[PDB]
mmCIF file with all atom_site columns, C-alpha atoms and ligand atoms in Angstrom:
data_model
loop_
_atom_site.group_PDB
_atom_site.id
_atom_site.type_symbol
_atom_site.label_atom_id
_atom_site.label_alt_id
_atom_site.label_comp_id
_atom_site.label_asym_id
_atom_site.label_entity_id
_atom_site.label_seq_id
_atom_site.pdbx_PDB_ins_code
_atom_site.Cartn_x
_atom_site.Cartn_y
_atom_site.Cartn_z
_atom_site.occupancy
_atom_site.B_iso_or_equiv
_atom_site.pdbx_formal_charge
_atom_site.auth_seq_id
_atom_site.auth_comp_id
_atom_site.auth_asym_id
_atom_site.auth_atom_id
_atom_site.pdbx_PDB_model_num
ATOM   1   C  CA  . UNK A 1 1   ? 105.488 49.050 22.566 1.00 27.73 ? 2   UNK A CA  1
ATOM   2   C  CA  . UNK A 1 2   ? 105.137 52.377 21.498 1.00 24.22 ? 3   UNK A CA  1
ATOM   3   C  CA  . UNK A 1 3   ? 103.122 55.035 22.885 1.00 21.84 ? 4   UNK A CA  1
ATOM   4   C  CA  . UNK A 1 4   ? 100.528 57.096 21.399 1.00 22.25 ? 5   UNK A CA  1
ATOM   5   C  CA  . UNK A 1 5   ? 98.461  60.214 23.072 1.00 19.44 ? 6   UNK A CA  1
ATOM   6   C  CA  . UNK A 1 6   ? 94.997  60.551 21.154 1.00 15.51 ? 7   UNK A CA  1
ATOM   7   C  CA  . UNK A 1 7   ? 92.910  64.051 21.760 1.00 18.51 ? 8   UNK A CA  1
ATOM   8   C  CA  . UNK A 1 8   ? 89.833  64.813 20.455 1.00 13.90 ? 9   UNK A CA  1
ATOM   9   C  CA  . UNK A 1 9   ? 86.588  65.682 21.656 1.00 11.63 ? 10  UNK A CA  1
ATOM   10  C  CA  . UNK A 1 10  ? 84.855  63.083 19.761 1.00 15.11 ? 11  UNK A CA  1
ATOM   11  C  CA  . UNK A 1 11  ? 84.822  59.964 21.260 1.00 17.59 ? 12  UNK A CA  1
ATOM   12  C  CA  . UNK A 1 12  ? 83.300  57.540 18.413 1.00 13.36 ? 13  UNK A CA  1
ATOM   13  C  CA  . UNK A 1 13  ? 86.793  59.592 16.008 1.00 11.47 ? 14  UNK A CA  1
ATOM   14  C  CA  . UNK A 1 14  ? 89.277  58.441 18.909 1.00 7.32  ? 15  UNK A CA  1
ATOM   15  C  CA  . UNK A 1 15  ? 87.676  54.998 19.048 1.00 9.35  ? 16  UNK A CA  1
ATOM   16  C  CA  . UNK A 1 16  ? 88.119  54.737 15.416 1.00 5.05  ? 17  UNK A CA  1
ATOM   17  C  CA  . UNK A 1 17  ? 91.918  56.176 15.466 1.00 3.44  ? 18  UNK A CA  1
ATOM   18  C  CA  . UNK A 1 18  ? 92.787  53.739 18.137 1.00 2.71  ? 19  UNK A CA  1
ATOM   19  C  CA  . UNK A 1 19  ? 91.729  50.908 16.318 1.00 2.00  ? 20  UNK A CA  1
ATOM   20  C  CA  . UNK A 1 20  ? 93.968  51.497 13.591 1.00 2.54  ? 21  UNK A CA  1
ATOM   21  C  CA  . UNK A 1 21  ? 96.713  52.232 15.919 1.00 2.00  ? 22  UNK A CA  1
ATOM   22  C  CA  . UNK A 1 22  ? 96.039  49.427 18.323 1.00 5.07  ? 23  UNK A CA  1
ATOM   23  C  CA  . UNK A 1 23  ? 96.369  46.957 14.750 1.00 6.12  ? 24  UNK A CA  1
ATOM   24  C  CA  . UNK A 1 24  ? 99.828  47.813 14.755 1.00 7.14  ? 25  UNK A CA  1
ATOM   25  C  CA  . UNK A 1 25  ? 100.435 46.889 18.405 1.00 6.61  ? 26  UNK A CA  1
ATOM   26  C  CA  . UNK A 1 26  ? 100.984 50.504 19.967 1.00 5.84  ? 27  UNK A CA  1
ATOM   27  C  CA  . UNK A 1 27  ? 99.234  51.199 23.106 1.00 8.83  ? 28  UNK A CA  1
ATOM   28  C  CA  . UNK A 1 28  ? 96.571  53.952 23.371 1.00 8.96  ? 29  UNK A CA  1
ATOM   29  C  CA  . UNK A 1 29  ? 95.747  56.917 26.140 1.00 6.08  ? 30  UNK A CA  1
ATOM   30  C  CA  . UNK A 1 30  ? 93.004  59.314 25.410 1.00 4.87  ? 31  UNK A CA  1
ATOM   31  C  CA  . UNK A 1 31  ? 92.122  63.077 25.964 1.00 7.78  ? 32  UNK A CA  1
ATOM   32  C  CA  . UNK A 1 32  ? 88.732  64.586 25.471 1.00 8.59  ? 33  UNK A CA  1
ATOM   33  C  CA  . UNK A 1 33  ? 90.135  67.857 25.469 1.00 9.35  ? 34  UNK A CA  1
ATOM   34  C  CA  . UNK A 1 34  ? 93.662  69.937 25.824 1.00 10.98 ? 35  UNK A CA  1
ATOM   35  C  CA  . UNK A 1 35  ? 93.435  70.402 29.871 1.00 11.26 ? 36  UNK A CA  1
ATOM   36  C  CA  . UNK A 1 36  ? 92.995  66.742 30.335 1.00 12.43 ? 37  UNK A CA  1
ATOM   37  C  CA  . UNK A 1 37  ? 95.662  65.903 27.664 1.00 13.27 ? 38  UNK A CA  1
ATOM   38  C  CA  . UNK A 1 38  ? 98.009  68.520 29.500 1.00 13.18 ? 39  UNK A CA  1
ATOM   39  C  CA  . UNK A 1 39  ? 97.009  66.901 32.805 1.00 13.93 ? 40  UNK A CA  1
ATOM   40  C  CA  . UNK A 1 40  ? 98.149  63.475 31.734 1.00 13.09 ? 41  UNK A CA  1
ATOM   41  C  CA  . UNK A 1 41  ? 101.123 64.540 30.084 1.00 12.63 ? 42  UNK A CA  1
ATOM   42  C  CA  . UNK A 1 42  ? 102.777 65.620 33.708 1.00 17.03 ? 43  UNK A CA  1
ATOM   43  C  CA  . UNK A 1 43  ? 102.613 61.754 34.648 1.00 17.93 ? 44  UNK A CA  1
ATOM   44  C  CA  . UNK A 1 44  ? 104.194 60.437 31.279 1.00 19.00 ? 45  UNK A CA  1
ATOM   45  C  CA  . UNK A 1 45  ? 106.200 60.784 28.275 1.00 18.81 ? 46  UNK A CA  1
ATOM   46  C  CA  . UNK A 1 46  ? 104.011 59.324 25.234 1.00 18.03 ? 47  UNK A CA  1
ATOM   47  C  CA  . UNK A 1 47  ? 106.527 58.496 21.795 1.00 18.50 ? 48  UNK A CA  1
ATOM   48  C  CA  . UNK A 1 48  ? 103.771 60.509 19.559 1.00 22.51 ? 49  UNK A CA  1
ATOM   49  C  CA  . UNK A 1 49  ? 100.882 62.592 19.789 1.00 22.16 ? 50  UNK A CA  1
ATOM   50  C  CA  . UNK A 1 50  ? 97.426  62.980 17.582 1.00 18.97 ? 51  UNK A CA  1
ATOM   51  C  CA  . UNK A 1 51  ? 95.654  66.332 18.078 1.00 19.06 ? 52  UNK A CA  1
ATOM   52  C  CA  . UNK A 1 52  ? 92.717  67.385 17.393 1.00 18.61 ? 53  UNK A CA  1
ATOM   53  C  CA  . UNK A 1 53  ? 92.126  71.323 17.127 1.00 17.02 ? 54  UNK A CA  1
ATOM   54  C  CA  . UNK A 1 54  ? 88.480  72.344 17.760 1.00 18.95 ? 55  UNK A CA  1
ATOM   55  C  CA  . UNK A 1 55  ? 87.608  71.618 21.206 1.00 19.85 ? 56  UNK A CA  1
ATOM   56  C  CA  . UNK A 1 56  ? 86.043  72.408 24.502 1.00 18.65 ? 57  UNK A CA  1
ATOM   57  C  CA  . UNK A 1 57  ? 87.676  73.618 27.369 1.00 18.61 ? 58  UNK A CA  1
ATOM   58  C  CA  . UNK A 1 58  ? 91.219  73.993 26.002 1.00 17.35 ? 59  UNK A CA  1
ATOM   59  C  CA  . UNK A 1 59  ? 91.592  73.756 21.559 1.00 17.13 ? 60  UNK A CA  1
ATOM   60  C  CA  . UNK A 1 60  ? 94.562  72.115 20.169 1.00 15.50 ? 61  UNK A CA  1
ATOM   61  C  CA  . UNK A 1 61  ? 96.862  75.612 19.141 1.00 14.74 ? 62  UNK A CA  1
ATOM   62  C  CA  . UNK A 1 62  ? 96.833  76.042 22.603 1.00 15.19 ? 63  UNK A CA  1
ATOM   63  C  CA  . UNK A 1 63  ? 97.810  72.944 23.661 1.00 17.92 ? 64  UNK A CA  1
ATOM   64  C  CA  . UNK A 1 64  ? 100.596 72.609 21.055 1.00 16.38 ? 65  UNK A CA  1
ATOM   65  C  CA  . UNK A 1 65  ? 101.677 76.612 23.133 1.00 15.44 ? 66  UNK A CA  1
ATOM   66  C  CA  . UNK A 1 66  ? 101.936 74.246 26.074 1.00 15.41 ? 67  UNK A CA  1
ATOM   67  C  CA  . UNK A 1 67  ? 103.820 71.386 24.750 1.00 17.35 ? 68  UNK A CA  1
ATOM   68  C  CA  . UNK A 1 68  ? 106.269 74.169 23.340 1.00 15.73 ? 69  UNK A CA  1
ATOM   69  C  CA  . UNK A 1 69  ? 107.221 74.942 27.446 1.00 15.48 ? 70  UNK A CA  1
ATOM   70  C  CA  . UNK A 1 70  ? 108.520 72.034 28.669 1.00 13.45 ? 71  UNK A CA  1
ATOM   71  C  CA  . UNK A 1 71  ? 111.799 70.466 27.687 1.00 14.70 ? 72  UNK A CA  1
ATOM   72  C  CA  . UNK A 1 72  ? 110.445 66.594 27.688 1.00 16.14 ? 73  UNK A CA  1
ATOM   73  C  CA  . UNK A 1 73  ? 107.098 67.715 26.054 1.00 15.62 ? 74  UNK A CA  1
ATOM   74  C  CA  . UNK A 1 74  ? 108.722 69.811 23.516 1.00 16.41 ? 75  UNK A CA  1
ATOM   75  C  CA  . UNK A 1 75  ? 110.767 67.249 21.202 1.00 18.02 ? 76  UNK A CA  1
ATOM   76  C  CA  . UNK A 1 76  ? 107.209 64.486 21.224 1.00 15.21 ? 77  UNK A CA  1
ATOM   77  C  CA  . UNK A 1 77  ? 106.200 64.607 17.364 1.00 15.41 ? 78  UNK A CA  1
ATOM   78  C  CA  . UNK A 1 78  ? 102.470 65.904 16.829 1.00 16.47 ? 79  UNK A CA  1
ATOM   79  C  CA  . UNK A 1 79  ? 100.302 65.184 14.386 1.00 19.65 ? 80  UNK A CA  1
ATOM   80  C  CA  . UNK A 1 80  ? 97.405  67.652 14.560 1.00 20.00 ? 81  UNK A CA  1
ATOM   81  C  CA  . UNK A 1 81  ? 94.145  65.708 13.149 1.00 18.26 ? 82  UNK A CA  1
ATOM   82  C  CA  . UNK A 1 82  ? 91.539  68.120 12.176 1.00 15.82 ? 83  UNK A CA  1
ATOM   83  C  CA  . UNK A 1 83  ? 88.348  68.755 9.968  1.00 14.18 ? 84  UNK A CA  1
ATOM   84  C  CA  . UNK A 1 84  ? 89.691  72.987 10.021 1.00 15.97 ? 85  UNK A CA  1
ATOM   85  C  CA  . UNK A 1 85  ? 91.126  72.773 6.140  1.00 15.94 ? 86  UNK A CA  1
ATOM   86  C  CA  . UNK A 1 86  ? 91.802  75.958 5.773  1.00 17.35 ? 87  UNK A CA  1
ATOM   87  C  CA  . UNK A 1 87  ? 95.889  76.941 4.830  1.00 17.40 ? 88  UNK A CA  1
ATOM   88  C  CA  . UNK A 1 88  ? 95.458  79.269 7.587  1.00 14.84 ? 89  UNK A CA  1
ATOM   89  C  CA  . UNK A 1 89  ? 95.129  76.630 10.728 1.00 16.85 ? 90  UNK A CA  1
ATOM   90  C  CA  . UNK A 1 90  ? 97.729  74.355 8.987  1.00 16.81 ? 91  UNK A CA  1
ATOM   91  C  CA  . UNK A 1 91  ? 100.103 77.205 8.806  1.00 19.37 ? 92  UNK A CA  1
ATOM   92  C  CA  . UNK A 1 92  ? 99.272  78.431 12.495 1.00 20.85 ? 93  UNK A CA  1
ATOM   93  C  CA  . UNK A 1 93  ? 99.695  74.274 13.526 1.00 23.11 ? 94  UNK A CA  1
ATOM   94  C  CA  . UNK A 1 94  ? 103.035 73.861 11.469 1.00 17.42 ? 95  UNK A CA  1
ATOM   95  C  CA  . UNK A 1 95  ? 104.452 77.493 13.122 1.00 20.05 ? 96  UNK A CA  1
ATOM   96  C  CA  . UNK A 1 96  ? 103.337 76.262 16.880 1.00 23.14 ? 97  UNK A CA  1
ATOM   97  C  CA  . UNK A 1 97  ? 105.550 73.248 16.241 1.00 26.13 ? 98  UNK A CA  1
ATOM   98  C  CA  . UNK A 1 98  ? 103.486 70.502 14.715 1.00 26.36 ? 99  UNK A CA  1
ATOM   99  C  CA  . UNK A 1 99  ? 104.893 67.667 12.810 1.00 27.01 ? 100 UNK A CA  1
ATOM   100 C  CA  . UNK A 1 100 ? 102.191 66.959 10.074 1.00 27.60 ? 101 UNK A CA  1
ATOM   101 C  CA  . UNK A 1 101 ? 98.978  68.513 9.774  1.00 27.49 ? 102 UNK A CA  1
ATOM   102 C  CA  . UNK A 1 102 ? 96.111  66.096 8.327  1.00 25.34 ? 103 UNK A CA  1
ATOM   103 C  CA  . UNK A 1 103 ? 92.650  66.501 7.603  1.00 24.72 ? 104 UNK A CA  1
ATOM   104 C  CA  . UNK A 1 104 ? 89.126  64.906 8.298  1.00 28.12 ? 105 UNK A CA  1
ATOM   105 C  CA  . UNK A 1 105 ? 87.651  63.492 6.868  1.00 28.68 ? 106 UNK A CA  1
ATOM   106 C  CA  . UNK A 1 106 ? 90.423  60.463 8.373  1.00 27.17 ? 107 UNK A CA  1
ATOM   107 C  CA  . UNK A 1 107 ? 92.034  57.737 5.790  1.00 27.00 ? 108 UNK A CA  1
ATOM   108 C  CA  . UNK A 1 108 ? 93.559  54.753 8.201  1.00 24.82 ? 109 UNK A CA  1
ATOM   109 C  CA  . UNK A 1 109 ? 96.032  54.006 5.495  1.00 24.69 ? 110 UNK A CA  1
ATOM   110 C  CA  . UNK A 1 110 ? 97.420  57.670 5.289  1.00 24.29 ? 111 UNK A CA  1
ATOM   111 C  CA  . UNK A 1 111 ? 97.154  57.761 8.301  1.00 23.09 ? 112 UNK A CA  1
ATOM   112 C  CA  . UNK A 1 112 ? 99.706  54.860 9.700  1.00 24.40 ? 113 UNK A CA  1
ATOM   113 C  CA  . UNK A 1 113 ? 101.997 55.616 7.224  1.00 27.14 ? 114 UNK A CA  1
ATOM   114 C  CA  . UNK A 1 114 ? 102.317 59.008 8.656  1.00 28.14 ? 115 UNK A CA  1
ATOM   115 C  CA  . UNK A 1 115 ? 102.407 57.365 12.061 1.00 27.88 ? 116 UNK A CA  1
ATOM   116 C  CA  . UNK A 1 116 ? 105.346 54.620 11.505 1.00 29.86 ? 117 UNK A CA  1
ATOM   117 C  CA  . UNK A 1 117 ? 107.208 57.510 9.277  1.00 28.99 ? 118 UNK A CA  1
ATOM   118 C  CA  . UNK A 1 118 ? 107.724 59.597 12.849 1.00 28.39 ? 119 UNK A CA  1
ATOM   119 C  CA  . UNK A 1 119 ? 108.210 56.598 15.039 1.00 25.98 ? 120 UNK A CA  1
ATOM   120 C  CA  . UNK A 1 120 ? 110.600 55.277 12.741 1.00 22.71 ? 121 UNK A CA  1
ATOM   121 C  CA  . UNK A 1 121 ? 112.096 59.276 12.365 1.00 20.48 ? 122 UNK A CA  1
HETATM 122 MG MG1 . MG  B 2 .   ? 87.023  68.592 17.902 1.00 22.24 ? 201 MG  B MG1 1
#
């Protein structure tokens, strides 16, 4: 099954994400924040990545920086998840290398469409 990397500092909005992700039979690994999402990324390769931007210890524009350094990192599609709506963060997001840019407040049905659109890419 397909692989999905879920960061955000908000555990009860990760608990909700993998639910709808978990209905279509893709397996879930969390991150509570960018450092720990980096940190698990050295072990494996996930097929897709949901990333929050607002966030202690590391935010997500750095992260997606990061992901933007490493050959097998570089080519996993992200799809930054975020309650910043502004034209500015989505155009920062989209420059960094970010697939999709969606906001909060979530929609599960927008939301798996966009999901099965870049696994199926
Ligand atoms: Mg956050």
């Amino acid at each position: 099954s397909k692989k999905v990397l879920l960061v955000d500092d908000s555990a009860p909005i990760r608990k909700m994400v993998s639910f709808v992700l978990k209905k279509e039979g893709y397996e879930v690994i969390e991150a509570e924040n960018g450092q720990i999402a980096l940190e698990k990324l050295s072990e494996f390769t996930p097929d897709l990545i949901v990333l929050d931007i607002m966030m202690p210890v590391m935010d997500g524009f750095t992260v997606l920086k990061k992901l933007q350094e490493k050959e097998e990192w570089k080519r996993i599609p992200v799809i930054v998840l975020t309650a910043k709506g502004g034209e500015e963060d989505e155009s920062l997001a989209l420059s960094l290398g970010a697939r999709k840019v969606m906001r909060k407040p979530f929609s599960p049905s927008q939301f798996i469409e966009e999901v099965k659109h870049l696994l199926n890419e």
